[PDB]
């Protein structure tokens, strides 16, 4: 008990704002998470409007309203449970918990929609506590009284705007000077809720054994208000005379019987039924279907008979019970939905829990369950216990001006009326001390900068200019001055911030964002995708034009935070808004495997530059644009020798020549000019470090060194052999183009001609794919693939029939297959000239010949014999492309 005393002194229903985030006993799941979440859910819709929803919509449709609204908040509490298990759970509120997991763009768009929903929540709680006062506590204490009979609907709006504005400016002064006394009353406001709920269930159990005696006065079908008179008779007997009652005086003109009366009043008789017959009676089968009506309609009972009258009716003057608002299904969804909001109250105390990754998912989910049980039990127990003609009666006009849910309670009706008065004034205090702390945390965070001032506070950190904005926004909801019109506006901001929490958790799971690994057990991305789809479907049931207003407000807060966050960082905004997009997309790719399922060439094309720096072989850019049809990566890297300290004047000239080609050749790519100490070295740096992160090259395209025997070129010729060794060590493909000056431009178009492929052995996967990619371009469009294979295996048939079903897997059987069959330096170059005689026998005049390229020698002294093997192999051919690669999958 001594340990249970300082725990209840430690209880508070407040969000940890910005002062708990700058400085960054311990609570449990029950006091830290469960009780603050349950206090912010059970509110004013249960006591004022729930019996009216069960009456108008019936038991079946109002069971469907609660099943949809409690599922949108259950699937959102699973998305909040994924955020609460990811990472460290930073101290201070639910704003810092969301915005560190989902980033500042989703964090600020949720935070400003949760600020606007909390502000109009304080407007609904102030309009709710005036409605309890002026209807049930002291109805005579109203300034603007109706001067005539039809003034009741107009003069009640004037009492709401006068008393609501005077309550709001008084509520804000208590928060500004006495907020420490508001926080001590956090346990009193919980006890007013819990004792009111127990008084309802105590009255339902008592209503089965003996129902209470409440009479409801009927006349035909229609139901008449009990405010003026007391007795339900047309006439009685006093002092030996047939005297008329006070019900006679309201319909008939004079108190005397013979003068004048209403036409409907004469032909029908006054029936007196019981209002709360109990759970023993079978009224549950009666009030099970909907009774939607227009405004001003009567509140009728199905059983009692009446006779219709064609005489005219002004029902406002006579004492009747009339429907105030024209009700629908979509209207009752919008009025009910603020009764389930309060998910985010479970993570107000993220810095004061001993295990926040375990307390936050457990306490919020157990709070949605225990409140959805209360709303689903009350709908069954209001329909089965109250006559449905009393449930259709807002403002309790049939019950002498008493609260309908209060007459059901056992000890007194004053338990609920006092209990709903203090807990609604208390929820207005929490909505007006909790929403300025949220705006101050967003303002001091710096992500939205026009709102920077709202981050000023007092010496202890309490908001000053954030209160003044919140009172002015909450004043516009009091000027609407009805509880039923603020509630669809309120529901629209909570459904909007629940939409982004479910969207951002589903996108970051699919797109594999780094630092998003939620270790919560019952979480799957479809369960947030389904929560996004249901909280979007409820958002267009309520109002479709409130939904487009909320999606355009919150969508423009999202893009404004991107623009100012990139203007702050990468210099200019238009330029910076693409540099943050490229950085954030490359950090996602940083984790995965280098190759997954398919191969496609991503080429580093090497250019040679001469003195008076111009491109030596410009058609090597033309051939790159024919493989890559303006789609993939293309790094254009070239190397000039010398130190960077003195040759950076020539490096600015040579780079402008490369940009001149890539505009004309329509190469949509990148340029990496490097000034290296030797031309050998700088090609070995572009092989291993051209391109950062996910986008790195995959293939190296070169040109054949034509001048084989020269003076200074024997250093430059040897660089060709050692860069074959570099690409095979880095596991990269290599493409050598011979006679690259006689390659087609982009404007030349071949007619007829043939592309000959010679798959001997070793990586025919790439070697079929390269002419298939050329064939899609308009230069190589009308050509034919001939694919040739030499045979040293005995049979040629199963060579061919397996090869013809290689293209059945590859969908390119338009090619035709043919098989041709017939000390180291002696053995190598003799095999070349035998194979040379084979290849020009079938490919003398072809447009392009593809060949496998042999591996470079390992001893390094045979690099002149390896190059003579390649020259003898390729004699008298117009266009040769030599292909080799290492370790890749073509499917």
Ligand X SMILES: *[C@@H]1O[C@H](CO)[C@@H](O[C@@H]2O[C@H](CO)[C@@H](O)[C@H](O)[C@H]2NC(C)=O)[C@H](O)[C@H]1NC(C)=O
Q: Which residues of this chain interact with ligand X, rule CB under 6 A?
A: 221, 269, 298, 300, 302, 306, 308
Smallest gap, in angstroms, from Cβ of residue 311 to ligand X?
Answer: 12
User: What does the alpha-carbon distance between residue 707 and residue 838 come to, in Å, rounded to a whole number?
Assistant: 26
**By C-beta, is 31 or 322 nearer to ligand X?**
322
What's 838's DSSP letter? H
From the list its own copies, ligand X, K ion, none, partner contacted by residue 342 (C-beta under 5 to 8 A by kind): K ion
On whether 771 is known to bind a ligand per the annotation, the reply is no
Smallest gap, in angstroms, from Cβ of residue 470 to its own copies?
Answer: 27
User: What does the alpha-carbon distance between residue 52 and residue 614 come to, in Å, rounded to a whole number?
Assistant: 85
From the list ligand X, K ion, its own copies, none, partner contacted by residue 43 (C-beta under 5 to 8 A by kind): K ion
CA 737 to chain centre: 50
From the list its own copies, Cl ion, K ion, none, partner contacted by residue 512 (C-beta under 5 to 8 A by kind): its own copies
Smallest gap, in angstroms, from Cβ of residue 484 to ligand X?
Answer: 23
**By C-beta, is 189 or 298 nearer to ligand X?**
298
On whether 343 is known to bind a ligand per the annotation, the reply is yes
User: What does the alpha-carbon distance between residue 299 and residue 291 come to, in Å, rounded to a whole number?
Assistant: 10
Rg of the Cα atoms in the chain: 41
**By C-beta, is 95 or 248 nearer to Cl ion?**
95
By rule CB under 5 A, what string of x and - marks binding of each residue 458-487 to Cl ion?
------------------------------
CA distances from 381 to 284, 385, 471, 688, 767 (A): 9, 6, 39, 74, 76
Cβ–Cβ < 8 Å for 462, 439: no
What's 223's DSSP letter? E
Smallest gap, in angstroms, from Cβ of residue 494 to K ion?
Answer: 9
User: String of b and e for 114-144 (b: at least 16 CB within 10 Å)?
Assistant: bbbbbbbbbbbbbbbbbbbbbbbeeeeebee
Q: For 208, what's the count of Cα atoms within 13 Å in the CB-facing half-sphere?
A: 8
**By C-beta, is 55 or 531 nearer to ligand X?**
55
**By C-beta, is 246 or 729 nearer to its own copies?**
729
* Number of residue whose CB is nearest Cl ion: 43
Place of tokens 């939607």: 292
Helices 525-542 and 50-72, axial angle in degrees (round to 10): 150
On whether 41 is known to bind a ligand per the annotation, the reply is yes
Residue choice 17, 32, 36, 43 for contact with K ion (CB under 5 A): 43
On whether 214 is known to bind a ligand per the annotation, the reply is no
Residue choice 90, 342, 413, 744 for contact with K ion (CB under 5 A): 342
**By C-beta, is 43 or 637 nearer to K ion?**
43
On whether 615 is known to bind a ligand per the annotation, the reply is no
Residue choice 245, 341, 430, 491 for contact with Cl ion (CB under 5 A): 341
| Close Cβ partners of 372 (under 8 Å, ≥ 6 residues apart) | 66, 70, 74, 340
| Close Cβ partners of 620 (under 8 Å, ≥ 6 residues apart) | 605, 607, 701, 703, 737, 740, 743
Smallest gap, in angstroms, from Cβ of residue 302 to ligand X?
Answer: 5
Smallest gap, in angstroms, from Cβ of residue 546 to Cl ion?
Answer: 18
On whether 442 is known to bind a ligand per the annotation, the reply is no
Smallest gap, in angstroms, from Cβ of residue 368 to its own copies?
Answer: 29
Residue 156, both tokens: 């009640």
From the list ligand X, its own copies, K ion, none, partner contacted by residue 221 (C-beta under 5 to 8 A by kind): ligand X
**By C-beta, is 401 or 691 nearer to its own copies?**
691
Smallest gap, in angstroms, from Cβ of residue 722 to its own copies?
Answer: 8
From the list Cl ion, K ion, ligand X, none, partner contacted by residue 302 (C-beta under 5 to 8 A by kind): ligand X
Task: Check residue 360 for interaction with Cl ion (CB under 5 A).
Answer: no
Task: Check residue 344 for interaction with Cl ion (CB under 5 A).
Answer: yes
Q: What is the dihedral of CA 112, 118, 123, 126, to 10 degrees?
A: -160
From the list Cl ion, K ion, ligand X, none, partner contacted by residue 343 (C-beta under 5 to 8 A by kind): Cl ion
**By C-beta, is 45 or 192 nearer to Cl ion?**
45
The H or E element spanning position 817 is: strand 816-820
Can you give the binding site for its own copies, defined by CB under 8 A?
510-512, 514, 540, 544-545, 548, 568-572, 574-575, 577-579, 581-583, 585-590, 592, 595-600, 631-633, 635, 644-645, 648, 668, 670, 672-678, 680-682, 684-695, 722, 725-726, 729-730
If phi > 0 it is left, if psi is from -120 to 50 it is alpha, else beta; for residue 89 that is: left
Question: Parallel, antiparallel, or unpaired: how do β-strands 215-219 and 222-223 relate?
Answer: antiparallel
Question: Which residues in the chain precede a discontinuity of more than 2.5 Å between C and N?
Answer: 24, 822
Residue 653, both tokens: 């000239």
Place of tokens 């910076």: 576
Q: Whole-angstrom distance between the N-terminal and C-terminal Cα of the chain?
A: 71
From the list Cl ion, its own copies, K ion, none, partner contacted by residue 809 (C-beta under 5 to 8 A by kind): none
Residue choice 13, 73, 341, 402 for contact with K ion (CB under 5 A): 341
By rule CB under 5 A, what string of x and - marks binding of each residue 8-47 to Cl ion?
-----------------------------------xxx--
Task: Check residue 434 for interaction with K ion (CB under 5 A).
Answer: no
Q: What is the dihedral of CA 253, 256, 257, 259, to 10 degrees?
A: -50
**In a 10 Å sphere around its CB, with 0-12 CB exposed, 13-18 middle and 19+ buried, how is residue 592 labelled?**
exposed
**By C-beta, is 289 or 644 nearer to ligand X?**
289
CA 724 to chain centre: 50
Cβ–Cβ < 8 Å for 106, 558: yes
Binding site as annotated, residues for chloride:
44, 338, 342-343, 498
Q: Which residues are annotated as a binding site for K(+)?
A: 40-41, 338, 341
Which residues contact K ion by CB under 5 A?
41, 43, 341-342
Q: Which residues bind Cl ion (CB under 5 A)?
A: 43-45, 338-339, 341-344
């Amino acid at each position: 008990v001594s340990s249970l005393l300082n725990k209840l002194a430690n209880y508070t229903n407040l969000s940890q704002g910005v002062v708990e985030h700058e400085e960054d006993p311990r609570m449990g799941t029950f006091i830290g998470v469960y009780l603050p979440c349950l206090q912010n859910i059970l509110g004013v819709i249960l006591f004022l409007r729930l019996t009216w929803i069960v009456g108008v919509a019936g038991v079946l449709e109002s069971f469907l309203i609660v099943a949809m609204c409690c599922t949108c908040t259950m699937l959102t509490a699973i998305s909040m449970s994924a955020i609460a298990t990811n990472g460290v759970v930073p101290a201070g509120g639910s704003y810092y918990m969301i915005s560190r997991s989902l980033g500042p763009e989703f964090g600020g768009a949720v935070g400003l929609c949760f600020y606007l929903g909390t502000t109009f929540a304080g407007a609904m709680y102030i309009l709710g506590t005036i409605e309890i006062f002026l209807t049930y506590i002291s109805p005579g204490a109203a300034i603007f009284q109706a001067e005539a009979a039809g003034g009741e609907a107009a003069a009640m709006l004037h009492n709401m705007r006068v008393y609501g504005t005077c309550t709001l400016v008084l509520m804000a002064l208590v928060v500004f000077v006495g907020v420490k006394y508001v926080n001590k009353l956090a346990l009193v406001f919980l006890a007013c809720v819990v004792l009111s709920i127990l008084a309802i269930y105590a009255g339902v159990i008592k209503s089965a054994f003996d129902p209470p005696d409440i009479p409801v006065c009927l006349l035909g079908n229609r139901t008449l208000s009990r405010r003026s008179f007391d007795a339900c008779v047309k006439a009685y007997g006093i002092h030996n005379n047939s005297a008329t009652s006070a019900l006679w005086g309201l319909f008939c003109n004079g108190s005397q019987p013979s003068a004048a009366c209403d036409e409907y009043f004469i032909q029908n008789n006054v029936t007196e039924i019981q209002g709360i017959p109990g759970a023993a009676s079978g009224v549950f089968l009666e009030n099970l279907w909907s009774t939607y009506a227009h405004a001003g309609a009567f509140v009728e009972k199905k059983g009692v008979p009446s006779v219709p009258v064609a005489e005219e009716s002004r029902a406002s003057a006579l004492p009747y019970v009339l429907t105030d608002i024209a009700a629908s299904f979509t209207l009752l969804v919008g009025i009910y939905f603020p009764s389930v909001t309060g998910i985010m109250a479970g993570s107000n105390r993220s810095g004061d829990l001993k295990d926040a990754q375990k307390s936050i998912p457990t306490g919020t989910i157990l709070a949605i369950v225990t409140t959805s049980f209360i709303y689903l039990s009350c709908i069954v127990l209001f329909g089965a216990c109250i006559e449905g003609v009393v449930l259709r009666d807002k403002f309790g006009e049939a019950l002498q001006g008493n609260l309908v849910i209060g007459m059901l309670a056992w000890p007194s009706p004053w338990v609920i009326v006092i209990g709903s008065f203090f807990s609604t004034c208390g929820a207005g205090l929490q909505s007006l001390t909790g929403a300025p702390r949220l705006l101050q945390a967003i303002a001091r965070d710096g992500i939205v900068p026009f709102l920077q001032v709202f981050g000023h506070g007092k010496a202890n950190g309490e908001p000053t200019w954030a209160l003044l904005l919140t009172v002015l926004i909450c004043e516009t909801g009091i000027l609407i001055a009805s509880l039923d019109s603020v509630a669809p506006i309120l529901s629209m901001f909570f459904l909007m911030c629940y939409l982004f929490v479910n969207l951002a958790c589903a996108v970051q799971t699919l797109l594999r964002t780094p630092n998003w690994r939620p270790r919560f057990k019952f979480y799957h991305w479809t369960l947030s995708f389904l929560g996004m789809s249901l909280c979007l479907a409820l958002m267009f049931i309520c109002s479709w034009y409130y939904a487009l207003s909320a999606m355009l407000i919150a969508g423009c807060i999202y893009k404004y935070i991107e623009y100012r966050g990139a203007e702050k960082e990468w210099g200019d905004g238009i330029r910076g808004l693409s540099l943050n997009a490229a950085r954030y997309a490359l950090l996602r790719v940083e984790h995965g495997p280098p190759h997954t399922k398919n191969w496609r060439p991503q080429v580093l094309v090497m250019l040679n530059l001469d003195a008076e720096q111009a491109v030596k072989h410009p058609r090597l850019l033309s051939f790159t644009s024919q493989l890559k049809a303006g789609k993939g990566l293309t790094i254009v890297g070239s190397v000039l020798e010398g130190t960077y300290l003195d040759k950076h004047m020539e490096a600015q000239r040579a780079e402008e020549n490369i940009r001149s080609l890539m505009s004309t050749e329509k190469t949509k790519g990148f340029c990496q000019l490097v000034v290296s100490s030797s031309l050998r070295d700088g090609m070995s740096h572009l092989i291993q470090s051209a391109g950062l992160g996910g986008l790195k090259h995959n293939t190296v395209l070169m040109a054949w060194p034509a001048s084989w025997k020269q003076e200074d070129n024997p250093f430059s010729w040897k660089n060709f052999v050692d860069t074959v060794r570099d690409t095979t060590a880095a596991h990269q493909a290599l493409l050598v183009a011979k006679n690259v000056d006689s390659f087609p431009q982009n404007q030349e178009r071949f007619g007829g001609g043939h592309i000959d492929v010679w798959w001997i052995v070793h990586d025919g996967g790439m070697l079929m794919l390269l002419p298939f990619l050329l064939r899609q371009h308009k230069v190589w469009r009308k050509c034919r693939m001939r694919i040739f294979t030499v045979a040293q295996v005995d049979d040629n048939s199963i060579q061919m029939k397996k090869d013809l079903q290689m293209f059945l897997y590859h969908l390119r059987i338009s090619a035709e297959v043919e098989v041709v069959e017939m000390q180291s330096n002696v053995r190598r170059m003799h095999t070349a000239v035998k194979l040379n005689g084979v290849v020009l026998n079938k490919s003398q005049d072809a447009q392009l010949v593809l060949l496998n390229m042999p591996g470079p020698p390992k001893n390094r002294q045979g690099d002149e014999n390896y190059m003579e093997f390649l020259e003898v192999l390729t004699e008298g051919l117009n266009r040769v492309l030599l292909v080799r690669g290492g370790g890749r999958e073509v499917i």
